[PDB]
Design a protein around this ligand. Structure first.
Ligand SMILES: Cc1cc2nc3c(=O)[nH]c(=O)nc-3n(C[C@H](O)[C@H](O)[C@H](O)COP(=O)(O)OP(=O)(O)OC[C@H]3O[C@@H](n4cnc5c(N)ncnc54)[C@H](O)[C@@H]3O)c2cc1C
Ligand SMILES: Nc1ccn([C@@H]2O[C@H](COP(=O)(O)OP(=O)(O)OC[C@H]3Oc4nc5nc(N)nc(O)c5nc4C(S)=C3S)[C@@H](O)[C@H]2O)c(=O)n1
Ligand code: SF4
Ligand code: MOS
Ligand code: FES
Ligand code: FES
Lengths: 330, 748, 157
């Protein structure tokens, strides 16, 4: 790694004040940050450990807001007694990610900010054309092996997929990201606006100033969140990112799907809310084939690249089967 | 069971306790004083020259002592290749010139005082290239094809027999690049002192390491000491050292200090070879009853521009069934890639995969049950060698495997068996591995405390050599084998050959069985010949060795520790082995120092056999595949340790599961880079991928195969598994996937 | 250029002054001379480095020794009691032959101890899933399930 200088922050505001300085980076769990430092894509001259900030560790489930601070680990959220019952899609987006060891390390704040698994992005010593890493240098994946790359939200500059499972469940259910600057004030960002499309600027992933730090997340507590599932398709059965995944939920009110929520993981540059599959199923009773045919509407915005065409076939099917699994609960 | 736990018992691993508490020390966990840390540099282009290399920013960083490249070189001699009688799988010599023959090639090493300093400074070396057009794939234009003619199979007349065959199956079967990926990365500690070098090298063959490192350094073989008591597995990837050890050795000699050099996990993909990609065009002629009268095969595999290594797809092709006319020819394709290396069952694995999928296609062309088809082709002898089998239980493997699996209830039509949203499929394949033999030696010592120590240079790579050599000696020493200590994996120990070709359990158990018999005779003689012994005058025929003591049938007795006190220390050390008693010592060195002196029985064809049955669950929407049930019946002959044998069996099967479902090398066609080189993008089976596995032992002791009665084990479990999984996926779906692996994109 | 920290490793204090880049994994191996924890990948993809930090299984290759300041680390060398009887997990691993080469075994064993404490030992499949974060290339998985099922039973008494 680069010979970084190690600094420990004693408050959220001092972490935001130190983060703002010229290439400094927060360290929470390390399972992304430290890995990409060894890959060579991260070389912060100053690394700021934020564990031992006790203010960010609060967690509670309510009748209205599920609320957790940024330093809550993946395991703590998933193991909370209400998580599986109140938010199955959130719970499923957790235990189906990484390994138990990683989930014990991984904070919710760092989980949202995890980076693409694009093989060319992660090997800068070999491939020097990455616009996300190295603005203006090109994209090595366009003419390379794009099997892992995006069929939705892609630009000419970056085709990288956002690998994370948790954000997919949050984006479906309209979570809010709360962030804080060095002077202590607070911004609340709807999560679908928190993740940015790469466009011509793949190096800007999130709506976060260098000024700012993620302090907390909150999710609306809804009967759509209560009846939900996270379905993850992958090559092997565990310890891998999704080839395709969908978080889905709805409330059944008067024998009818209402507040249908659907989001697509693993196929897009950012967690992708499928709004037209939702609208097509709203006011509709849960049934096998109408769910499957409505899911195929995602194929009107989808664009296959050379090696990722299988993701086009998977996308409507993981949407359908995640919905089918949701309608089996209550 | 039985208290001494002799050969044939199923006991716990004698090395188990030091492994479960973290005491056992692998290669780089040893502690020389003030060691330096090397980090290897690898090329980023497939073909060309190094036009510009500037290390000054690396030499200027913290703690960096040296950077060795072709611009700041150190002599490394081209080693003698394995095929020429040497210890070298790869003859590549790093930092001797600017030529780039493949991507990821070792072009240098950075030596620093701490590991963190060496890692950082290695990233600061700037390398520019002048690239030349690269041959990325074996099918590219301009790729030279070298036939392996000495391995051609010309048997009967295949052209005539195929022309008259009623039913012909003609298809191509491919396997991708695969990587052994043992959990212990390739790493070493090279310590050069005063004209000698000691190297801590994870090794399956320590005599081979000693030969190649001496050749690299240009010194006598006796001047190299290799210390490898524990290995984190090679599965074929650590029989012989690779060039990162060469760089570690010459650096240690130049700096006159110990150097710890670890390949990073990504660097182990191009720092040595895995299984090269293979392709085989396989034609089966048969009469309409299913009986096969002809087989024609044309296959090839990748190899580097430098070394000729063949992964030969004909290994099992004429062995398995009763076919009098077989034509097989294999060629290697020289491309820009690292020199290939062994992976579990080399040449046997891809040969069985193509053959045993082709049988399934022949079975569906004639609508014969696949098992029934293997019986109609049963070979009552070896048709390739025209020799009788020594022992072959394959029929009992078919029957006991089919019974346990429920194969009699199979509905032949693909997609017929379904549960919920999963398509069910059932598949089966034959498997085999050959019996090889090599001589070897061992020493047994009675300590002053009355304890036994067994010494052999053979390796325990996780196979259990530590355990079975203690069981062998216990049979003649009258003590429990758990009290016998075994020392292994060091060139200071008695001669031993490679652990490869699944031959070493039989070779070493034979060598220790002789040494232990000789130890028994020595102890009884001492009790009767030592005048201070309470047994001082008595006949040896009436002595027995029991429970740590020598006891006369007249009732008087002498303990083993008491005999140690009465005996000269040199008489308490006994040597034995399976070399001819008259063979000069120099030839005993040469035999174990190369790979070409292995023997097989004349007059008998001796092989292990297996029957593999698999149930897969294919998701109807997603095309994902899961292995629900595995039933295997294996003939390994006599099992030296049935519990360690099962661990080998299921170990090979799980590796075969990764081969079929997930493992693939991914090469970028533009640059020839392997871009999935890491354990995240190169998928090996995860605990959740593997169900409960049933293994059935159908074997009987075969003394025409090995002296001690066992046959091959270590590599048997993988053979044919990938074909049975493909046959099962077809039965679930209706799609033949002839290229591995079978991933969801290929299903839907 | 250097940092100072104290670490609780298997019940003993360890003050260190080190390059801040040193991972917990290499602090145990290269510094404290506790080599039981293994490095198979170093990027967090394997789990041979699994240790316990404050009772929880983590990957020491992705943990900086700086992050372990004032923390309780339990490596494989600390599972034995003060007299050094084998932990039930360690003994069931030998009896059921849950290892072959032994290199993934320390991480396998530490991950299984925490897996049991976490309550993930309830069934064979549950063990498979929540042990999947430890790769074994030797293929000892079926025996790892046996060893963990048996050890969870013994510990419940
Ligand atoms: C082998 C492997 C497999 C994996 N598989 C999966 C998977 O299947 N599914 C999945 O969802 N994830 C997976 N992950 C990723 C894992 O979930 C994330 O790395 C983890 O959630 C990141 O959390 P962390 O606390 O380690 O963040 P860190 O690694 O500490 O930080 C990540 C990034 O976020 C920034 N950051 C951290 N905290 C804050 C804050 N409070 N404010 C602003 N920025 C911050 C850091 O500067 C850093 O750039 C995998 C990781 C590995 C290594
Ligand atoms: N008749 C027999 C023969 C063998 N055995 C058991 O099987 C083991 C292996 O015997 P053998 O078939 O002679 O295997 P080798 O020691 O000659 O070589 C091992 C073989 O199988 C392997 N097993 C491995 N296991 C581990 N854990 N790691 C590796 O890298 C391994 N690599 C390999 C590879 S590849 C090979 S070539 C013995 O220790 C013994 O426990 C037995 O019980 N009865
Ligand atoms: S895809 Fe995005 S990340 Fe991957 S290479 Fe192109 S730009 Fe860099
Ligand atoms: O013969 Mo085993 O080393 S591939
Ligand atoms: S060494 Fe930490 S997970 Fe591989
Ligand atoms: S014991 Fe060898 S990797 Fe698991």
């Amino acid at each position: 790694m680069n010979p970084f200088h190690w600094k420990v922050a004693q408050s959220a505001s001092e972490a935001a004040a130190l983060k703002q300085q010229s290439g400094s980076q927060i360290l929470a769990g390390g399972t992304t940050q430290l890995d990409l430092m060894k890959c060579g894509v991260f070389n912060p001259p100053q690394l700021i450990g934020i564990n031992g900030l006790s203010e960010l560790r609060s967690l509670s489930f309510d009748n209205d807001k599920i609320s957790a601070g940024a330093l809550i680990t993946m395991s703590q959220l998933a193991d909370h007694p209400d998580c599986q019952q109140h938010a199955p899609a959130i719970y499923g987006s957790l235990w189906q990610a990484a390994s138990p060891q990683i989930r014990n390390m991984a904070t919710l704040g760092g989980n949202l900010r995890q980076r693409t698994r694009c093989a060319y992005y992660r090997d800068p010593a070999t491939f020097s054309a990455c616009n996300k890493r190295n603005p203006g240098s090109g994209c090595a994946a366009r003419q390379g092996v794009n099997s892992n790359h995006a069929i939705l939200g892609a630009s000419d500059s970056c085709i990288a997929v956002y690998p994370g499972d948790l954000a997919v469940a949050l984006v479906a259910f309209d979570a809010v990201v709360i962030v804080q600057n060095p002077q202590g004030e607070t911004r609340r960002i709807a999560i679908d606006d928190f993740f940015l499309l790469p466009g011509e600027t793949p190096d800007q992933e999130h709506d976060l100033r260098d000024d700012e730090i993620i302090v907390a997340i909150e999710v609306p507590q809804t009967a759509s969140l209560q009846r939900s599932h996270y379905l993850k398709v992958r090559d092997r059965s565990s310890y891998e990112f999704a080839a395709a995944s969908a978080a889905a939920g709805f409330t059944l009110e008067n024998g009818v799907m209402r507040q249908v929520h659907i989001a697509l993981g693993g196929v897009a540059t950012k967690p992708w809310r499928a709004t037209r599959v939702e609208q097509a199923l709203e006011g509709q009773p849960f049934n096998e084939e109408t769910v499957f045919q409505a899911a195929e509407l995602i194929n009107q915005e989808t664009q296959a690249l050379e090696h990722n065409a299988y993701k086009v076939k998977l996308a409507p099917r993981v949407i359908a089967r995640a919905l089918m699994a949701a309608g089996e609960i209550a | 069971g039985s208290p001494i736990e002799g050969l044939g018992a199923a006991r716990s691993r004698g090395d188990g306790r030091v492994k479960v508490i973290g005491e056992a020390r692998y290669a780089i966990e040893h502690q020389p004083e003030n060691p330096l840390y090397g980090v290897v540099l690898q090329s980023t282009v497939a073909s060309g020259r190094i036009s510009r290399l500037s290390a000054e920013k690396a030499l200027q960083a913290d703690g960096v002592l040296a950077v060795y490249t072709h611009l700041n070189p150190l002599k490394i001699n081209k080693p003698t290749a394995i095929a020429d009688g040497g210890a070298a799988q790869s003859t590549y010599t790093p930092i001797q010139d600017d030529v780039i023959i493949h991507n990821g090639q070792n072009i240098g090493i950075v030596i620093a005082e701490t590991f963190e300093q060496a890692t950082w400074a290695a990233s600061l070396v700037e390398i520019e290239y002048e690239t030349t057009p690269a041959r990325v794939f074996a099918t590219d234009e301009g790729v030279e094809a070298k036939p392996m003619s000495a391995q051609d199979i010309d048997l009967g007349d295949a052209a005539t027999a195929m022309h008259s065959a009623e039913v012909r199956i003609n298809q191509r079967y491919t396997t991708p690049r695969e990587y052994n990926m043992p959990m212990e990365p390739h790493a070493c500690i090279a310590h050069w002192h005063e004209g000698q070098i000691t190297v801590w090298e994870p090794s399956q063959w320590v005599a081979g390491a000693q030969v190649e490192i001496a050749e690299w350094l240009g010194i006598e073989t006796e001047k190299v000491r290799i210390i490898s008591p524990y290995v984190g597995g090679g599965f074929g990837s650590k029989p012989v050292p690779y060039t990162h050890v060469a760089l570690a050795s010459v650096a240690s000699r130049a700096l006159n200090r110990p150097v710890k050099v670890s390949l990073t996990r990504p660097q182990t993909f191009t720092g040595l070879g895995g299984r090269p990609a293979t392709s085989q065009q396989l034609e089966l002629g048969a009469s309409r009853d299913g009986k096969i009268e002809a087989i024609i095969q044309r296959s090839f595999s990748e190899t580097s521009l430098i070394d000729v290594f063949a992964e030969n797809c004909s290994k099992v092709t004429a062995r398995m069934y009763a076919v009098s006319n077989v034509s097989a020819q294999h060629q290697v394709r020289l491309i820009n890639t690292v020199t290939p290396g062994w992976m579990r069952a080399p040449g046997e694995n891809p040969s069985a995969f193509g053959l045993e999928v082709a049988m399934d296609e022949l079975a569906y062309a004639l609508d014969i049950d696949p098992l029934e088809l293997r019986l109609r082709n049963w070979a009552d002898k070896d048709y390739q060698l025209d020799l009788p089998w020594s022992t072959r239980r394959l029929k009992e493997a078919y029957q006991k495997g089919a019974e346990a699996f429920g194969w009699d209830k199979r509905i032949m039509t693909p997609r017929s068996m379904r549960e919920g949203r999963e398509l069910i499929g059932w598949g089966m394949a034959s498997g085999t591995y050959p019996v090889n033999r090599l001589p070897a030696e061992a020493k047994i010592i009675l300590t002053p405390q009355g304890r036994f120590v067994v010494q052999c240079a053979g390796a325990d790579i996780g196979t259990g050599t530590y355990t079975i050599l203690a069981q062998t000696a216990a049979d003649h020493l009258g003590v429990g084998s758990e009290t016998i200590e075994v020392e292994l994996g060091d060139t200071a120990l008695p001669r031993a050959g490679v652990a490869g070709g699944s031959q070493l359990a039989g070779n070493l158990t034979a060598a220790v069985n002789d040494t232990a018999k000789k130890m028994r005779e020595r102890l009884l003689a001492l009790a009767s010949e030592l005048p201070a012994s309470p047994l001082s005058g008595l006949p040896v025929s009436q002595f027995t060795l029991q429970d740590g003591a020598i006891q006369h049938s007249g009732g008087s007795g002498l303990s083993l520790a008491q005999l140690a006190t009465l005996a000269p220390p040199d008489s308490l050390s006994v040597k034995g082995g399976t070399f001819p008693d008259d063979m000069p010592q120099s030839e005993r060195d040469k035999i174990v120092r190369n790979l070409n002196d292995m023997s097989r029985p004349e007059a008998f064809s001796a092989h292990s056999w297996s029957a593999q049955f698999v149930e897969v669950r294919v998701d109807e929407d997603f095309g994902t595949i899961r292995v629900k049930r595995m039933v295997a019946a294996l003939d390994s002959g006599r099992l030296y340790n049935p519990k360690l044998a099962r661990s080998q069996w299921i170990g090979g099967m799980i590796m075969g599961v990764g081969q079929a479902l997930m493992e693939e090398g991914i090469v970028d066609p533009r640059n020839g880079r392997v871009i999935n080189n890491n354990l995240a993008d190169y998928l090996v089976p995860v605990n959740g991928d593997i169900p409960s596995i049933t293994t059935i032992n159908v074997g009987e002791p075969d003394f025409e195969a090995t002296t001690m009665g066992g046959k091959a084990v270590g590599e048997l479990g993988i053979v044919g598994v990938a074909a049975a999984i493909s046959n099962a996926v077809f039965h679930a779906t209706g799609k033949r996937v002839r290229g591995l692996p079978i991933t969801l994109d290929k299903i839907i | 250029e250097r940092i100072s920290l104290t670490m609780q490793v298997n019940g003993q204090p360890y003050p260190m002054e080190i390059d801040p880049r040193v991972t917990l994994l290499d602090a145990l191996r290269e510094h404290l001379n506790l080599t039981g924890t293994k490095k198979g990948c170093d990027q967090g993809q394997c789990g041979a480095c699994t240790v316990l930090v404050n009772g929880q299984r983590v990957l020491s290759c992705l943990t900086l020794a700086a992050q372990a300041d004032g923390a309780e680390v339990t490596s494989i060398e600390g599972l034995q009691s003060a007299s050094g009887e084998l932990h039930p997990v360690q003994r069931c691993f030998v009896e059921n032959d849950a290892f072959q080469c032994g290199y993934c075994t320390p991480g396998q064993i530490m991950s299984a101890v925490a897996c049991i404490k976490e309550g993930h030992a309830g069934s064979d499949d549950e063990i498979r899933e929540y042990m999947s974060g430890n790769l074994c290339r030797c293929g000892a998985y079926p025996h790892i399930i046996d060893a963990i099922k048996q050890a969870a039973a013994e510990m419940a008494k």
